[PDB]
């Protein structure tokens, strides 16, 4: 017969990403939010929230995941598929495993971790229509509310075990770069500096951590048109000398994102070009200081658009100033609160983690037509930011020979 | 604050994955479905259905897009971080570019490509609530309604064109098999063996196509309990001879996923694991010949259920015997409507690309405990079916010497 739901307690528990205690806080908190607004539960489908209160890092492949947060419990819910896996990686106090051999098995896991609830923790900005009309059937008594923007709130401010794996995530998106540098020649495709540099970096995770999950990571070496858009994928395009290049390193960690982007040049950079990188990094500079608790992001924003406007580049712009950090990829995560954007008024406090990473983009026709950009990571502490990306910006450096 | 939408022209238009009339035929077969159910207009959010209709694969990192389309639009609405890379993609009438400077510009180019509709038919399976909520209150006048169910039934018939991308990617997936048992030794980390495996993809693709877009293409390589779990992440783990091993390997390709899986051993097999590999690769060329026009899913899961429940294991099953190809990835797509599932019904037809990926798992200490799985993928045509995985299964040819 072929059950709806079991467990699957296979092997041992891994050694998990942060301490015990680490995980303790997080969990703490979330309850005393639950508890100030009578929420009996809350159940979290999105990776990054997953990831953030227990340690799993789902693989969707088109099924449901869910972790359940009561006063009492952590229930992490799997499919089958994915055998004892989720259960060696949960910080919490259980796994159910649903089955592929009914639809909708998933809604029983969920109903077995969950009994009863007159109040439950939805992610409005991830749960979809299908899924919230499954579950609101599953109780249609409860009332569904939001969590989501209360727990980003939460993610916005780092830990000191985060600020350390920030860190090392910093650490190895530096080797990223070096590795870009290193395999760039002329007339190398894009995809293959890409490769040279993500090898580096998975191969110093796996260096560093020892029960590390090597995923996602990558590398955007972007060349000439191609600089145009500041995540545009890998193509076969050839580097050129002179041509405006764009490194950008991204370890994943843990679900743990950091970041290294940096405007390079391959054997020179005409006067067009430099000129242009030139007024990028005295934005990115400026941004530097800016960077401080107290500092409203809407106005580190106007702050330094009066620069670009000094110089008649404003419109060339193309995107915020900087975001947050912490469990984020290209595909889940990221505190919107957190946003280095022109109408955002969150004022910066100690622990959080932000970039500062000006762009501007001319289009072909122009002189000096490209994308640049530079990309560092600041940790927001006592009395400033702690500026945690150690390899060179701009001309000083970046024209390689 | 400055402006919300913008147009970005920036270069020249690349040359697209299938013919304009691979493009035309789809959309036309999407506007002959919207006429029929009288909605003015489709807005696709999903990575899949964009990338189905215009040929633009977006990278989220926490941002919003959109596919309009009408009976005389396709216009996509991409971000101002993007500038022109959306624009060179998209199959279709226009692209719109939105920009950070205020909250809910998105919304602003939505409501700038569709001025006016009474239905608008969106994908409720990928659709968020926060989002849904914001574009009911652009459109307070306008029926919101799936299409999502509609476009996975008219995805799940592919035409040659796209038959032709899958054998093109199964091939690849074929040297990225042999690039596994390349890189096999004794005590080789499981990392290294997946980097040396997609770096023989990334390249294969690259030569192959032209104007292609080199992104996501991984390798699962499991080996001990890490082949417990199909989805399992790449460890550090070291392989000994005699180890369970699993090798998957997937180029991913213009949107397009493919894959090779095979269970392999290095120097040998114990008699515990050599029995069980063979009740698997037993059921799994009986799966290869039940698949053909006419069968149902249903009655393909519960004759191989019943061969393996002469082997007294079928407990040990793990998930469904198989899928529909397409545009997806382990993060987008997937036809719910096309599973090897005991409750699914569907008539496997001509066109259908399905795969065939038996697994039992048996969990450790038991003898022979690891996990065992072949997969295969099988074009439905007319009389029968095309399998299109030309790499070995058994232990014939996967006791790797
Ligand atoms: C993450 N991304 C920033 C953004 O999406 O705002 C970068 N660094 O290009
Ligand atoms: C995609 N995945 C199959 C599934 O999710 O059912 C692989 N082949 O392991």
Redesign the interface.
């Given at each position: 017969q072929?059950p709806k739901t079991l467990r699957?307690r296979?092997?041992d528990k891994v050694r998990s990403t942060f301490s015990a205690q680490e995980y303790a806080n997080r969990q703490a908190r979330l309850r005393a939010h639950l508890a100030a607004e009578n929420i009996d539960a809350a159940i979290f489908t999105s990776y990054h929230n997953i990831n953030y209160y227990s340690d799993f890092?789902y693989?969707?492949?088109?099924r449901p995941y869910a972790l359940v947060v009561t006063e009492d419990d952590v229930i992490s819910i799997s499919?089958?598929?994915?055998?004892?896996?989720?259960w060696r990686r949960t910080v919490g106090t259980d796994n159910i495993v649903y089955?592929?051999?009914?639809?909708d098995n998933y809604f029983a896991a969920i109903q077995q971790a969950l009994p009863k609830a007159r109040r439950i923790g939805?992610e409005?900005?991830?749960?979809?229509?299908?899924?919230?009309?499954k579950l609101a059937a599953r109780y249609p008594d409860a009332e569904l509310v939001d969590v989501?923007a209360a727990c980003m709130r939460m993610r916005m401010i780092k830990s000191a075990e985060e600020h350390v794996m920030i860190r090392h995530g910093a650490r190895i998106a530096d080797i990223g770069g070096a590795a870009v540098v290193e395999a760039l020649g002329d007339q190398v495709?894009?995809?293959e500096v890409?490769?040279h540099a993500?090898?580096a970096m998975?191969?110093a995770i796996?260096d560093t951590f020892?029960?590390?999950?090597?995923?996602d990571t990558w590398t955007w070496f972007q060349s000439g048109?191609?600089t145009?858009?500041?995540?545009?994928?890998?193509?076969?395009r050839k580097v050129n000398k002179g041509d405006i290049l764009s490194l950008n390193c991204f370890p994943m960690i843990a679900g743990y994102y950091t970041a290294l982007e940096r405007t390079l040049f391959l054997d020179h950079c005409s006067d067009d070009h430099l000129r242009l990188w030139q007024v990028n990094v005295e934005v990115h500079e400026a941004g530097l200081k800016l960077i401080k608790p107290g500092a409203r992001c809407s106005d580190i924003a106007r702050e330094l658009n009066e620069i670009f406007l000094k110089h008649d580049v404003?419109?060339y712009?193309?995107?915020?100033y900087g975001?947050s950090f912490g469990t984020?990829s290209?595909?889940y995560?990221?505190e919107?609160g957190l946003?280095l954007?022109?109408?955002i008024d969150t004022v910066l406090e100690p622990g959080m983690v932000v970039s500062m990473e000006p762009?501007i983009?001319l289009?072909?026709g122009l002189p000096g037509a490209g994308?640049y950009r530079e990309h560092d990571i600041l940790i927001v502490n006592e009395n400033g930011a702690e500026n945690i990306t150690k390899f060179p910006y701009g001309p000083e450096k970046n024209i390689i020979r």
């Open positions: 072929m699957i296979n092997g890092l693989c969707s492949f088109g499919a089958n598929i994915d055998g004892g896996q989720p089955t592929d051999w009914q639809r939805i409005h900005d991830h749960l979809n229509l299908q899924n919230r009309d989501a495709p894009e995809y890409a490769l993500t090898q998975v191969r796996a020892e029960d590390v999950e090597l995923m048109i191609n145009d858009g500041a995540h545009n994928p890998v193509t076969t404003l419109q712009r193309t995107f915020g975001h984020l290209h595909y995560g990221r919107a946003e954007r022109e109408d762009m983009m289009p072909e994308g």
